[PDB]
Amino acid sequence: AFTVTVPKDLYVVEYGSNMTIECKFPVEKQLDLAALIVYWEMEDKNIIQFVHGEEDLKVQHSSYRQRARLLKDQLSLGNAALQITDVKLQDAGVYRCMISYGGADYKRITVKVNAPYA
Amino acid sequence: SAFTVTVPKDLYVVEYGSNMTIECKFPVEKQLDLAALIVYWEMEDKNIIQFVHGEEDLKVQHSSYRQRARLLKDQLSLGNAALQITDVKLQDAGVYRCMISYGGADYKRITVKVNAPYAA
Ligand SMILES: Cc1c(NC(=O)c2ccc(CNCCO)cn2)cccc1-c1cccc(NC(=O)c2ccc(CNCCCNS(C)(=O)=O)cn2)c1C
């Protein structure tokens, strides 16, 4: 069965940093953009939806409007990498990545945001 | 205008020992395309039913749903992922999640309340 993996299920990040969280999925041979859906959400907020070789942007939640991107390059390696830029305490929580690619799976990732220090 | 899953009810109140059928609707424009369809039902991370590419998996199905859960295949052609659990117990109360991939993808949550058995 098709299986998604996370290198870490817990990220501890510093306030104001950039954060990149990752879900790995098998790509034998080359990538097939037509068969690939990748969705990231937190607490039911639509962060990034990549459906059929393209991101949506319309249904993306306002709080992630110019902050979240999927690293397109990484998709060909079988890596759904979410970058959130300028991490705030509101970004602490449980992230869910959902992948459909000849099979489907999802995984949960917890983010702790430590308070501003640096 | 993205693909959207709907639930006619997001809360089922069921009697102890009854059968329960919970439903997620998804658009089927023309005929059904079994090759492109994934339907997954889970509760509290337990694999209830996984329908991948015109067939159920059954290897990965959780032990506590082994002879109790089935997807009503007939209903799929109408755009209805219908999960039947037979002989509902109090352990079946909780939050159910159906996940559908068919052209696009969506999921919905359903809460099940199981009322207690009578002394009748
Ligand atoms: C729903 C979804 C999306 N979501 C959206 O795009 C979306 C979703 C929601 C919205 C927002 N709309 C508003 C809603 O309120 C807006 N876009 C994206 C991609 C795929 C899916 C989807 C589809 C169908 C089925 C499944 N799941 C499964 O089939 C599944 C999952 C998990 C496990 C368990 N296994 C664990 C590993 C062990 N592995 S082992 C033993 O070695 O076998 C098993 N099977 C998923 C994840």
Residue numbers in the entry:
A (entry chain B): 4 to 121
B (entry chain A): 3 to 122
What did the original publication write about this model?
We managed to cocrystallize PD-L1 with compound 17a and solve the structure at the resolution of 2.5 Å. The asymmetric unit of the PD-L1 costructure with 17a with the P1211 space group contains six chains arranged in three dimers bridged by the inhibitor found at the dimer interface. Moreover, numerous symmetrical hydrogen bonds are also reported, such as between amide carboxylate linkers and A,BMet115, or nonsymmetric with ALys124 or BAsp122. Sulfonamide polar group, although smilingly stabilized by hydrogen interactions with BThr20, is not resolved well in the electron density and is mainly water-exposed outside of the “hydrophobic tunnel” between PD-L1 monomers, likely contributing to the solubility of the 17a. The addition of compounds that displace PD-1 from PD-L1 results in rescue of the PD-1 signal. A total of 83% of dissociation of the PD-1/PD L1 complex was achieved using 2-(ethylamino)ethan-1-ol and N-[3-(ethylamino)propyl]methanesulfonamide (17a) as a solubilizer.
A series of nonsymmetric C2 inhibitors were synthesized and evaluated for PD-1/PD-L1 interaction inhibition. These compounds induced PD-L1 dimerization and effectively blocked PD-L1/PD-1 interaction in a homogeneous time-resolved fluorescence (HTRF) assay with most inhibitors exhibiting IC50 values in the single-digit nM range and below. Structural insight into how these inhibitors interact with PD-L1 was gained by using NMR and X-ray cocrystal structure studies.
